Symmetry: D2
Amino acid sequence: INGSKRIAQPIRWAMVGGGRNSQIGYIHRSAALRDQSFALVAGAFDIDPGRGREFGVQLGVDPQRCYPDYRTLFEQEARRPDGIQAVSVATPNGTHFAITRAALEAGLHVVCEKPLCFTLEEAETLREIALANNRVVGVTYGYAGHQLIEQARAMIADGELGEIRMVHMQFAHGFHSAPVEATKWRVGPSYVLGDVGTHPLYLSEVMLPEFRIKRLMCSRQSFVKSRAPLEDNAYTLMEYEGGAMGLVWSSAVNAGSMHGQKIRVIGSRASLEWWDEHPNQLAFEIQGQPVQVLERGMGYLHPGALLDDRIGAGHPEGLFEAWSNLYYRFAMAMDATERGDGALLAGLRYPDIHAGVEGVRWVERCVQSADRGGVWVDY
Amino acid sequence: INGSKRIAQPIRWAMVGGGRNSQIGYIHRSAALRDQSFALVAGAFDIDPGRGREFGVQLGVDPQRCYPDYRTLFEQEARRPDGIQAVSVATPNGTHFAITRAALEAGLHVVCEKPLCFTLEEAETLREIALANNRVVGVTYGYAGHQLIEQARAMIADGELGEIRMVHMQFAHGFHSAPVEGQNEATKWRVDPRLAGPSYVLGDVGTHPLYLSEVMLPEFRIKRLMCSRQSFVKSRAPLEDNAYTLMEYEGGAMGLVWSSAVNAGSMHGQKIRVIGSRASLEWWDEHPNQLAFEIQGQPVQVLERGMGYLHPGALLDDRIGAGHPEGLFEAWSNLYYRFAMAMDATERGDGALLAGLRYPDIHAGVEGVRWVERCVQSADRGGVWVDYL
Amino acid sequence: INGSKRIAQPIRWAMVGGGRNSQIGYIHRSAALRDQSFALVAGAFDIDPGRGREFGVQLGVDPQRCYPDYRTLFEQEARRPDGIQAVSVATPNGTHFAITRAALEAGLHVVCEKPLCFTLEEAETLREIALANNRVVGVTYGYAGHQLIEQARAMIADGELGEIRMVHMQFAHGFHSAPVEGQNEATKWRVDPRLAGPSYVLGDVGTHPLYLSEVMLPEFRIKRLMCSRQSFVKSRAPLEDNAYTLMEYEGGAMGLVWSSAVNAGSMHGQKIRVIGSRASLEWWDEHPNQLAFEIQGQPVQVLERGMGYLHPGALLDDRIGAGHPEGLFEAWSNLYYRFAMAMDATERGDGALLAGLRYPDIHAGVEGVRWVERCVQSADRGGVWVDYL
Amino acid sequence: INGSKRIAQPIRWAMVGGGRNSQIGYIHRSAALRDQSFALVAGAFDIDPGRGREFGVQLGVDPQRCYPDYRTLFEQEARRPDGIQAVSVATPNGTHFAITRAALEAGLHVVCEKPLCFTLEEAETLREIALANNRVVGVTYGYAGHQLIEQARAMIADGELGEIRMVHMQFAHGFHSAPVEATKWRVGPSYVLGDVGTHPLYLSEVMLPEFRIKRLMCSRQSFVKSRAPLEDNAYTLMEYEGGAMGLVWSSAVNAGSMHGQKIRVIGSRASLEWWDEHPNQLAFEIQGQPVQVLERGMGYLHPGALLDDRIGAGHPEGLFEAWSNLYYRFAMAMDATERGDGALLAGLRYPDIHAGVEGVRWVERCVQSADRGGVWVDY
Ligand SMILES: NC(=O)C1=CN([C@@H]2O[C@H](COP(=O)(O)OP(=O)(O)OC[C@H]3O[C@@H](n4cnc5c(N)ncnc54)[C@H](O)[C@@H]3O)[C@@H](O)[C@H]2O)C=CC1
Ligand SMILES: NC(=O)C1=CN([C@@H]2O[C@H](COP(=O)(O)OP(=O)(O)OC[C@H]3O[C@@H](n4cnc5c(N)ncnc54)[C@H](O)[C@@H]3O)[C@@H](O)[C@H]2O)C=CC1
Ligand SMILES: NC(=O)C1=CN([C@@H]2O[C@H](COP(=O)(O)OP(=O)(O)OC[C@H]3O[C@@H](n4cnc5c(N)ncnc54)[C@H](O)[C@@H]3O)[C@@H](O)[C@H]2O)C=CC1
Ligand SMILES: NC(=O)C1=CN([C@@H]2O[C@H](COP(=O)(O)OP(=O)(O)OC[C@H]3O[C@@H](n4cnc5c(N)ncnc54)[C@H](O)[C@@H]3O)[C@@H](O)[C@H]2O)C=CC1
Ligand SMILES: O[C@H]1[C@H](O)[C@@H](O)[C@H](O)[C@@H](O)[C@H]1O
Ligand SMILES: O[C@H]1[C@H](O)[C@@H](O)[C@H](O)[C@@H](O)[C@H]1O
């Protein structure tokens, strides 16, 4: 990657949410504006119209296209020949469904934050409106943009681990060990299952695209009792079709842990393990051989895992590179749709409406199991 | 520790098992003989009397005290004024019960290998006989000898982690990812119910970090558990080479044990993480001289063996200054000197010394058997919650 | 940082070099374009005008502002009312002096790639011209943009390490262990004196952690140094692919720099350890979000980017909450926004803002050239002590 | 290793030093008594006769063979048919020469602590007395007993690193960062050069037996000024015959460092790196390939590196195992000498009189260079 243009002109783009004091607003813009993928021309940046406009102007947005709310954004932009083509939804979880639905009905492509929405019926309603209106829905499972996730997928498909036996996933941080705005709204049918567990779950779907969950059980806890019934800790044990096992540990009360997102795929011959805090390395551990570390950008990687390198091996890339790798694919997908290039659109892989639906499905089944005291449920 | 004797004379000692080709025989002797705790004066070292006697002679044992079997060992030693006072049992799991019972009935102290036996009923029988005969029974949960386990126990009791919320345990190695039992006698018996018992990895490796949790959290009581177990090498069924045990403690803390012999690429992977409201501790058997201590909101720390900031109890067993790596042989030596002090204290009827000593004993052995039995009951019922007691 | 503009309008910007196949061209643009600091409106991107123009068009540059060479770029842009205000120079080392001088004489601000130039005389000439023309000169010591470098500087100034005794620096990678310059244009020019200068690894990688030491210890002055340099790939002689620089600071602290491109197996290996009477700090470029902080007698600590326990100056540039990994692109973005603020402040004659800004500037570039020149003088005399000034 | 006897009966053994409060006394006994190599039958354990005897009795020694001093030990033991055959010298550095010389003249085999002695003339005097009296002198370069040091030697000899270019050694701990009995005497022509620098120097001699130092320079400092002229920090840069370079960083003022003994051997093709605090792993880093970690006890190791395994791979061995590996070789060497088995004696490798001499030579040359302001000197 050298900043060459992927599409003829940047997608005309807005955000809803991601305002001045938001945790995630900035990485959406840093990734979307990079390499001429998107141009930020409008937004409803803040729950408060006045702060949305002040912030919007500082981002270089036309003051008149800093709108009080998503409805006004979609209505007013529809009247302009240079109106937005796509919107990123970076609001709290409870508004994802309504905003995404409104954007799709207005004929806009959408990038929606995870978890996509609360219920599986909402998720499949967004999917059917997206399909009817021929719109791209991206979902910011940002960690999936790291090159070594593709390396892992390519190695598993090539049989380098032998027969897959176990998938061990965690996203277990300590930032909510204590009863500490962003946290207030998080504390919806779930907290950490949707907030963090869905991340390495989606990494498992990228690495093992043919794996199907047969049944699962989930035991969830509110260690900070005032969060009940929202869980700040959960254990999900899964049986895949064919007899492989999966385990997801979701947590916001793993005291001392800075992030702790890890995925270990264990085969008959070898394991791989990836850790989000050191995203440029992939452990590759053949039983009976010295353990190995695979590095981003090295010539021994599969060709697919080298495509998105922005600097030579040994220079650390980070999560902004991963997000940039998703956003250029989002832009290529939206552009392909506008030009009616069904061929390009068919060859692209990115976290899409189907990834969003599967994350919502998984949370729903975990909550069903957990509310019943951690019993097996059919997936 | 400077090699000073702990008891007036070494305990007169034998082994059953632990012969020439055994995996674990050597660490028993290396730990028992150290610092004048035990003297190896007899044994039945091998399933084959001939190989047992040839090996016994190489260990410096009198050829006439290399016996063909444990029955002969106990009978012939009873007829000597310098007869053994204690025996270590390092045979496959299926013989632990019979040998330990025979040794207790012959009036001997015992160090029995884990797992103690197959059934909770066997375990309670050995406990009754050990009590009736006033004998010490040690169990070689060897990892519990590492000083930083005592550091973790002292910190938790002192409230340094806040309120305990989770205990995450694994012992997940990759050595049996392939069907190596075809080629490897030690693996072979582990995958035969007649020889290994109701389980493979739950008893073989899961009980290790479980016992570390009992040392760190002595007042925790498991309320209920569930266990899902797999035979990834299908020929091992019904014995599991992988298992997940999820536990609810009284008080609402959660425990998780991952037991595995098919974690391909893992050299050992025994880890325990204790998670509290304020902080976490994490210990890893392959780097036993360090303890991760992670206070939420503060820089992570590593606590090092032998440093002046440790609790006094965690410094007692240091054999060399901080920074020099101790290993699993030091951990086993720390259990065996305690075994010797317990056995000597019993012979001298020193109830006071006996009360101050902490070592893996008959009760630790019984709890390990109880845990495996409950896991197997849950797993055989499709991994459903079962009452622990 | 939330993408808020730092200056009223983006600086009108070009590059010389950094074309389609370049190693470093992209990170310049990724950092400069971010957060509305610079706008890329022209360039001479390639040694080959045709490849420069085709690439320029893919970058969204007007085909008529893709110029064949730097002279044409400066001349033609001067004839436009929307002419460039600043240029980044990403060419091989041998052209830095001529291009930077030409840009300064054309009244342009400059971001010049390290090393600034070949000789200390060239460096002092660029400094004089930059001062006469009131122009900012940034130097892309990019690793200095990492927040935890500012954390280390703040801790040292606060006396958290005690009295500083040693500074241990390396940048020792293995990419040129084999003679890959046969095959690789970027390696090829680095091993030719005409193109690369008086040194290879001293200037190419040694100057990076050296500049980190100047950021962390701004009041340290090198008194004298010695340098032993080797050409392990003999065809590179007289340019070194390995070097040891030992330095005595005024005050009696010692510094060590290991510069290498033949550290086989090393992916980058840029590290700085600052050792004081009370504690040490250690930073490693491949894991830039952590800082080891090791107080003697206490548990080692790791300081994490974005945590509330950091000094306020080390939190200013956080673009995402603690635990999410930033990378070298964030470090470069942190230097480029400062470059833009410095250039804008100069144009508005805002002496006050200019005094508060810290970034690698003409003086950092001169000191890097001085250090290489002294090392080469020592090495050519068989690695003897030489006076630094 | 399964505790099988290497020699027909244990060597009759004494210590001088290594008493109740000594730092190193215990590991000598733990290693020497193991696997029936040595039997502790006498000693002069303490500078104070009374404390030597009290401690001696607690170690199981005949009270009458706990002697006030080394002269009395050697004289009285010579009168007994069951008299000592060998002595380990664990006293402060200044007494090594006199005690070792006396032991050799009394016809005893000796294990002497490093550094062997102060001067090269003393070292070559011990060598000539040892040779004249046909005695074994072992030197407790204990780290050399770790199996993966042999693995490194075997890999280098087999050309696995390509042509050797650089040897980077450190022993840099922080325990004397502050002006803190054992430390008092350490603070002799040197402190950290002899106390710690000689350790990884000897590892380089085991790994690269054919390497010869051509010239070196050493810059040494007294950061705790009251130690002057003894150095608590030193840098030694070395040129080997053939143009490889070596670097030794010796330190007791590396604040926060728990031990920091490391050796990295860098070849044209690959590097190896060993760290004493994690002695069961060896980094093996082929340029252009994933980095690897070699583990103690694994089947992929050279046969020589498996001989001393006392437990299966994955169980951590420590420095007591390394010392035990030196002491059984010391015992086999002494026994071979007594039986006049010149054949066995010739096949054994252990840190011996020659290792002791080379450590003393290296310290002398470093001190010569450092006293002259860190100038190159011929080796
Ligand atoms: N993909 C990932 O890695 C991450 C995703 N997220 C997701 O991003 C979303 C936002 O999370 P945070 O940034 O942490 O929340 P936040 O609470 O930090 O910020 C929310 C922002 O949305 C604005 N806002 C709220 N309601 C609005 C409305 N109706 N219209 C317009 N603006 C509105 C607020 O003014 C604020 O600027 C959530 O869905 C969360 O799950 C958050 C962090 C990481
Ligand atoms: N505490 C720990 O960390 C470990 C415990 N163990 C336990 O130690 C025991 C032995 O395990 P391994 O050494 O791996 O087995 P192994 O198969 O390697 O050795 C068994 C030994 O006992 C001998 N033996 C078998 N039956 C005998 C009998 N009836 N009488 C006398 N000798 C007999 C065999 O000849 C052999 O010497 C098992 O209970 C196992 O669970 C094993 C490894 C580690
Ligand atoms: N700050 C840092 O971390 C790094 C700095 N650098 C520095 O950046 C500079 C470039 O290095 P690389 O990108 O590795 O070199 P490279 O060989 O990869 O690329 C050189 C580029 O400049 C172009 N070029 C050459 N001469 C030119 C001229 N007269 N006019 C216009 N374009 C010209 C070439 O066509 C090519 O696009 C060097 O000074 C190097 O020291 C390089 C890598 C990292
Ligand atoms: N090989 C290795 O890894 C190590 C070697 N050493 C070396 O071991 C030797 C001793 O070091 P530490 O144990 O640290 O010293 P220390 O000061 O801790 O103990 C010295 C012991 O020798 C006794 N002693 C002193 N003079 C004596 C004499 N004339 N006769 C009999 N006993 C005497 C003292 O009573 C004391 O027991 C030194 O040469 C040191 O360099 C020390 C630590 C590690
Ligand atoms: O490999 C394991 C390990 O040695 C355990 O410590 C032991 O309990 C098991 O029996 C053995 O199979
Ligand atoms: O590989 C290195 C690295 O990118 C350094 O950051 C740079 O200064 C050098 O020029 C380059 O060769």
